[PDB]
Structures are given as C-alpha cells and as structure tokens.
C-alpha cells in the first residue's frame, strides 16, 4: 500500500533469488501487496543481472537503504503533485479527473527522447518507461495515493486502467503501437465496440492487486542480448510464477500460465504439472473467464507442439487460434496478431511441412485430419477478413497456401468431407466456401486458388 513496514524491512537485504521470493511470498500474504516496493526490487535485480559477466555465482544485493530511498522518491513525486482535496472521492470511487491527473503526473515525468525499462526502478532512476510500464506506473501511483479501486487492465497487446465499482470505468493511460493518435483519458468503449483483437471484445483482464503482482512477474525480461538470457532472472521468474500459481493468483491469467509452461519446458521443476497440463490450464482459464476469446492460449500450445514436432497437434492448435480470430474484425492497431498469423501461415507452417516431407523421402502429410486442420486454419483467417476495415490476405499468402496444400497428395486430401456452412469439416468464410473443390483436386490449380484467396 503506502509506507514500508518492519515486516518488509526485516526481510532485507535481499542477497539471493530465494530472498526475493520470500519477500514476494510475504507481500502476497497481505490483503494489499505493495506494488511500488515489489516493482523497485524486481527492477533493481533485473538491472544488475541483465548484463554479461565473469563469475559463476553473482547476485546484486538489494540493500534496504537503496530500495527505501527510491521508494521515498516515488512516493514523494506522486503525493507532491496530486492534491487529493481538489478531487471529490465519493463512495470509495476515484473520479476520472483524479485518474487522469495521476496519469498525467507519470506521463509528464518521462524523458522526451527498448529492454529493461518496464519497472518503477527504470522510472525513478532514468525517467524511462515502456508502454505497459506507464500503465503499471499509473496503478502503483494510485495505490500509493490510497485509491483502492484503480486497477490494471490488460488485453493480449495493450494495457490501461479500470476503476469505480467492479472496474466499470475505463481510461487509456499509455500509448500503443507507433504512429497512432493519443487516446489517453478516453474510455476503451470504442475499441470494445469495433470488435478489434486489441480490446478482445471486452473479454480482457481486470486485475486485482495480486494479479498486478503476477503482471510485474510476467514483465521480468531475462534477455541480456540477442543470444543470451540471464539464467538467474529466468529462475526468479519461474519461482515467482509457481508462488503465484500455488496461491491461486494465476487462475484468471492465461498468459501467465503459458509463460509458466514455457519456463517448465525450458527446465522442468520436479513434482510440478508438465508443460502440456499448464498450457491446457491456460486454455481452460480463457474458456472459463474470458469467453474463449483469447488467441495466445492456443498460440502457446501450438508453439510447444511445433518445437516437439507433434505436427498434428500443432496444426490443430493453430486452427484453434484461427477459429477464435474469425469472430473479430481486423482493425488498424491489431498488427501484432496479424504479424503472428502471417508468420504462422507463410513461414512456420511451410517449414514444418517441408521438414515433414523430407522425412517421408527417407506421415502427417498422410493424415487427412492434419489436412482438415490446415483447412480450418485458412478458413478462420478468411472469415476474420470478412467485415474487417482493412484487408488481410494478399498474393504472398497465396504463394504459401498452395505450397502447403501441395505437401498433401490428392489421395490424402480427397478423404475430407468439406461442407459449406449454412474427417468432416464445415467452412464459414466465403473464400474457402468458394474454392472448396479446388482444395481436393488431384492437380492443385495454383492460379484459381491464388485468385480466389486474393478476391475482395
Ligand atoms: N508477443 C507476444 C506475447 C505472447 C505470445 C507470442 C507468441 C506465442 O506463440 C504465444 C504467446 C505476449 O504475451 N506479449 C505481451 C503481451 N502484453 C499484453 C499487455 O501489454 C502489451 C503486451
């Protein structure tokens, strides 16, 4: 909340990964974990671990004196710029005016001209923050001001704040993407209503304080350079996520579960659920709390199957991402999910299939199920295009669809009972409904298919 207590101070100095975990375990026991304290600690240890080094054992000691000084500087900066008497706080509800005031305080503090600028350590010592860092900084400043209703909101690619009863009020506080006009101060209602992926049709995360702790743990960046990760930061993140997991605080956080699965794939913790179980918990969480309208739970699972060369389950998981995206409209700030679908369609899937082909020269290319999955994937992309502001498919997509269908013999392909929506498979998009017979011809007509995919 506000002000360091002896129950925290007594756990300093933090001389190890396990010392940090112990501080987090104690903070998560309290009704209201201190976001400013935890973010400064993570930012301090990350700052000094994210560098190449000589020396087998190293841990940068977080002395209480340096953490409490940075804490006091943050707390003074915010209390000293925000007079709460000028803001009626009726009913335990912050006003949009107050919320935008705190956001402006943070905003006006940032430098005017990358990695490891996500924490309040970065804010206080270098006045630099990345996009979701700003939003987290606004929530921490509000907690420092006693505004118990201001919370972090997160989609799969953006962050803002919610407040009021049950977080019914929303406010943009940070930037998104590169050249877009500032929306700070506005509600997210337009983004929800335009059906963009960026705002998840309203099925976005609304954090309590413990989920905000989970967010800052997911925000740890172990990357030192393009070829190197800090093993210490990976281990710290993995232990903190298991701590959050055990306390139930990842229950409504699919991306944290996927992150935890990836970490367990990297180095499994003895006695813990295996990565596959964790990926499916993330999917279960998205189905339970978020109407199965998230993309990444299936993208996480697909990547895992891809790495493990389970071609069938990878394709199925990728088709699932497309079955989710088909209900959205592609909008002008949804580029990241476009880039991902693009890469999957025109890079990952072709190479995975090329690797499969090279193997039969010396078996999923013979699975009709696998071909069904590939069709369902492309049908979702086409249906996604329908009703969308900007076009999705283009000639590049066309080149690799035909190349990927070619990896299946007409013998294989002919065993799938394609059905126009009005292994058996039903189509929902006009384009795929269109060229359905073309997908099963013993001779793929490249030009026809290429044409119908690129149609308006
Ligand atoms: N890119 C990516 C991410 C995940 C991913 C990518 C590929 C996969 O195959 C599976 C998962 C990811 O979650 N990024 C951070 C999301 N934040 C949301 C709040 O603020 C904006 C950033």
mmCIF file of N, CA, C and O in Angstrom, residues 314-351:
data_model
loop_
_atom_site.group_PDB
_atom_site.id
_atom_site.type_symbol
_atom_site.label_atom_id
_atom_site.label_comp_id
_atom_site.label_asym_id
_atom_site.label_seq_id
_atom_site.Cartn_x
_atom_site.Cartn_y
_atom_site.Cartn_z
ATOM 1 N N UNK A 314 0.119 -29.445 -33.366
ATOM 2 C CA UNK A 314 0.469 -28.077 -33.729
ATOM 3 C C UNK A 314 -0.549 -27.496 -34.702
ATOM 4 O O UNK A 314 -1.039 -26.373 -34.514
ATOM 5 N N UNK A 315 -0.862 -28.242 -35.764
ATOM 6 C CA UNK A 315 -1.819 -27.749 -36.748
ATOM 7 C C UNK A 315 -3.171 -27.521 -36.104
ATOM 8 O O UNK A 315 -3.810 -26.492 -36.319
ATOM 9 N N UNK A 316 -3.608 -28.470 -35.283
ATOM 10 C CA UNK A 316 -4.889 -28.321 -34.607
ATOM 11 C C UNK A 316 -4.912 -27.071 -33.736
ATOM 12 O O UNK A 316 -5.877 -26.295 -33.772
ATOM 13 N N UNK A 317 -3.839 -26.844 -32.964
ATOM 14 C CA UNK A 317 -3.794 -25.658 -32.118
ATOM 15 C C UNK A 317 -3.789 -24.386 -32.951
ATOM 16 O O UNK A 317 -4.424 -23.398 -32.575
ATOM 17 N N UNK A 318 -3.088 -24.387 -34.094
ATOM 18 C CA UNK A 318 -3.095 -23.196 -34.939
ATOM 19 C C UNK A 318 -4.468 -22.968 -35.546
ATOM 20 O O UNK A 318 -4.900 -21.821 -35.709
ATOM 21 N N UNK A 319 -5.159 -24.047 -35.908
ATOM 22 C CA UNK A 319 -6.523 -23.896 -36.399
ATOM 23 C C UNK A 319 -7.414 -23.301 -35.314
ATOM 24 O O UNK A 319 -8.259 -22.443 -35.591
ATOM 25 N N UNK A 320 -7.180 -23.691 -34.059
ATOM 26 C CA UNK A 320 -7.920 -23.113 -32.941
ATOM 27 C C UNK A 320 -7.700 -21.606 -32.836
ATOM 28 O O UNK A 320 -8.657 -20.854 -32.615
ATOM 29 N N UNK A 321 -6.450 -21.132 -32.997
ATOM 30 C CA UNK A 321 -6.239 -19.684 -32.999
ATOM 31 C C UNK A 321 -7.062 -19.022 -34.099
ATOM 32 O O UNK A 321 -7.577 -17.911 -33.919
ATOM 33 N N UNK A 322 -7.193 -19.685 -35.254
ATOM 34 C CA UNK A 322 -7.931 -19.081 -36.360
ATOM 35 C C UNK A 322 -9.427 -19.141 -36.100
ATOM 36 O O UNK A 322 -10.169 -18.228 -36.475
ATOM 37 N N UNK A 323 -9.884 -20.219 -35.468
ATOM 38 C CA UNK A 323 -11.291 -20.317 -35.098
ATOM 39 C C UNK A 323 -11.681 -19.239 -34.092
ATOM 40 O O UNK A 323 -12.830 -18.778 -34.093
ATOM 41 N N UNK A 324 -10.729 -18.782 -33.263
ATOM 42 C CA UNK A 324 -11.014 -17.681 -32.349
ATOM 43 C C UNK A 324 -11.007 -16.354 -33.093
ATOM 44 O O UNK A 324 -11.892 -15.517 -32.894
ATOM 45 N N UNK A 325 -9.991 -16.125 -33.932
ATOM 46 C CA UNK A 325 -9.837 -14.826 -34.580
ATOM 47 C C UNK A 325 -10.945 -14.566 -35.592
ATOM 48 O O UNK A 325 -11.213 -13.404 -35.922
ATOM 49 N N UNK A 326 -11.613 -15.612 -36.089
ATOM 50 C CA UNK A 326 -12.605 -15.396 -37.140
ATOM 51 C C UNK A 326 -13.765 -14.529 -36.672
ATOM 52 O O UNK A 326 -14.359 -13.831 -37.490
ATOM 53 N N UNK A 327 -14.056 -14.501 -35.369
ATOM 54 C CA UNK A 327 -15.144 -13.662 -34.883
ATOM 55 C C UNK A 327 -14.740 -12.211 -34.680
ATOM 56 O O UNK A 327 -15.605 -11.390 -34.357
ATOM 57 N N UNK A 328 -13.473 -11.862 -34.874
ATOM 58 C CA UNK A 328 -13.036 -10.484 -34.725
ATOM 59 C C UNK A 328 -13.046 -9.769 -36.072
ATOM 60 O O UNK A 328 -13.158 -10.387 -37.127
ATOM 61 N N UNK A 329 -12.904 -8.446 -36.019
ATOM 62 C CA UNK A 329 -12.630 -7.614 -37.185
ATOM 63 C C UNK A 329 -11.200 -7.100 -37.104
ATOM 64 O O UNK A 329 -10.801 -6.514 -36.089
ATOM 65 N N UNK A 330 -10.445 -7.291 -38.183
ATOM 66 C CA UNK A 330 -9.080 -6.794 -38.243
ATOM 67 C C UNK A 330 -9.070 -5.272 -38.285
ATOM 68 O O UNK A 330 -9.540 -4.666 -39.251
ATOM 69 N N UNK A 331 -8.513 -4.657 -37.249
ATOM 70 C CA UNK A 331 -8.523 -3.212 -37.098
ATOM 71 C C UNK A 331 -7.106 -2.639 -37.103
ATOM 72 O O UNK A 331 -6.112 -3.365 -37.032
ATOM 73 N N UNK A 332 -7.032 -1.306 -37.196
ATOM 74 C CA UNK A 332 -5.811 -0.589 -37.542
ATOM 75 C C UNK A 332 -4.717 -0.672 -36.479
ATOM 76 O O UNK A 332 -3.613 -0.182 -36.730
ATOM 77 N N UNK A 333 -4.978 -1.257 -35.307
ATOM 78 C CA UNK A 333 -3.934 -1.445 -34.302
ATOM 79 C C UNK A 333 -3.812 -2.898 -33.870
ATOM 80 O O UNK A 333 -3.237 -3.182 -32.813
ATOM 81 N N UNK A 334 -4.334 -3.817 -34.682
ATOM 82 C CA UNK A 334 -4.222 -5.254 -34.481
ATOM 83 C C UNK A 334 -3.006 -5.862 -35.198
ATOM 84 O O UNK A 334 -2.975 -7.080 -35.414
ATOM 85 N N UNK A 335 -2.010 -5.043 -35.557
ATOM 86 C CA UNK A 335 -0.891 -5.512 -36.376
ATOM 87 C C UNK A 335 -0.170 -6.717 -35.769
ATOM 88 O O UNK A 335 0.255 -7.623 -36.496
ATOM 89 N N UNK A 336 -0.011 -6.750 -34.444
ATOM 90 C CA UNK A 336 0.795 -7.814 -33.847
ATOM 91 C C UNK A 336 0.185 -9.185 -34.110
ATOM 92 O O UNK A 336 0.896 -10.139 -34.450
ATOM 93 N N UNK A 337 -1.135 -9.316 -33.958
ATOM 94 C CA UNK A 337 -1.722 -10.630 -34.215
ATOM 95 C C UNK A 337 -1.695 -10.934 -35.703
ATOM 96 O O UNK A 337 -1.579 -12.096 -36.102
ATOM 97 N N UNK A 338 -1.771 -9.908 -36.549
ATOM 98 C CA UNK A 338 -1.597 -10.134 -37.978
ATOM 99 C C UNK A 338 -0.202 -10.676 -38.264
ATOM 100 O O UNK A 338 -0.043 -11.717 -38.908
ATOM 101 N N UNK A 339 0.822 -9.993 -37.747
ATOM 102 C CA UNK A 339 2.192 -10.455 -37.936
ATOM 103 C C UNK A 339 2.350 -11.906 -37.498
ATOM 104 O O UNK A 339 3.008 -12.692 -38.184
ATOM 105 N N UNK A 340 1.688 -12.304 -36.401
ATOM 106 C CA UNK A 340 1.784 -13.690 -35.938
ATOM 107 C C UNK A 340 1.081 -14.660 -36.880
ATOM 108 O O UNK A 340 1.618 -15.731 -37.184
ATOM 109 N N UNK A 341 -0.138 -14.335 -37.314
ATOM 110 C CA UNK A 341 -0.830 -15.222 -38.248
ATOM 111 C C UNK A 341 -0.063 -15.321 -39.560
ATOM 112 O O UNK A 341 0.082 -16.409 -40.134
ATOM 113 N N UNK A 342 0.448 -14.183 -40.037
ATOM 114 C CA UNK A 342 1.301 -14.155 -41.218
ATOM 115 C C UNK A 342 2.476 -15.114 -41.073
ATOM 116 O O UNK A 342 2.689 -15.992 -41.916
ATOM 117 N N UNK A 343 3.248 -14.961 -39.989
ATOM 118 C CA UNK A 343 4.413 -15.815 -39.781
ATOM 119 C C UNK A 343 4.023 -17.282 -39.728
ATOM 120 O O UNK A 343 4.717 -18.135 -40.295
ATOM 121 N N UNK A 344 2.914 -17.600 -39.057
ATOM 122 C CA UNK A 344 2.499 -18.994 -38.958
ATOM 123 C C UNK A 344 2.129 -19.527 -40.335
ATOM 124 O O UNK A 344 2.556 -20.620 -40.722
ATOM 125 N N UNK A 345 1.369 -18.746 -41.112
ATOM 126 C CA UNK A 345 0.883 -19.236 -42.399
ATOM 127 C C UNK A 345 2.010 -19.341 -43.419
ATOM 128 O O UNK A 345 2.093 -20.322 -44.159
ATOM 129 N N UNK A 346 2.901 -18.354 -43.449
ATOM 130 C CA UNK A 346 3.840 -18.183 -44.548
ATOM 131 C C UNK A 346 5.281 -18.508 -44.173
ATOM 132 O O UNK A 346 6.185 -18.333 -44.998
ATOM 133 N N UNK A 347 5.522 -18.993 -42.961
ATOM 134 C CA UNK A 347 6.881 -19.309 -42.546
ATOM 135 C C UNK A 347 6.898 -20.596 -41.740
ATOM 136 O O UNK A 347 7.458 -21.607 -42.180
ATOM 137 N N UNK A 348 6.256 -20.577 -40.569
ATOM 138 C CA UNK A 348 6.332 -21.725 -39.668
ATOM 139 C C UNK A 348 5.678 -22.951 -40.294
ATOM 140 O O UNK A 348 6.285 -24.030 -40.357
ATOM 141 N N UNK A 349 4.418 -22.817 -40.726
ATOM 142 C CA UNK A 349 3.709 -23.957 -41.319
ATOM 143 C C UNK A 349 4.425 -24.495 -42.557
ATOM 144 O O UNK A 349 4.625 -25.715 -42.647
ATOM 145 N N UNK A 350 4.812 -23.668 -43.539
ATOM 146 C CA UNK A 350 5.572 -24.220 -44.678
ATOM 147 C C UNK A 350 6.813 -24.992 -44.259
ATOM 148 O O UNK A 350 7.011 -26.133 -44.694
ATOM 149 N N UNK A 351 7.645 -24.409 -43.395
ATOM 150 C CA UNK A 351 8.864 -25.100 -42.994
ATOM 151 C C UNK A 351 8.556 -26.382 -42.235
ATOM 152 O O UNK A 351 9.181 -27.417 -42.483
#
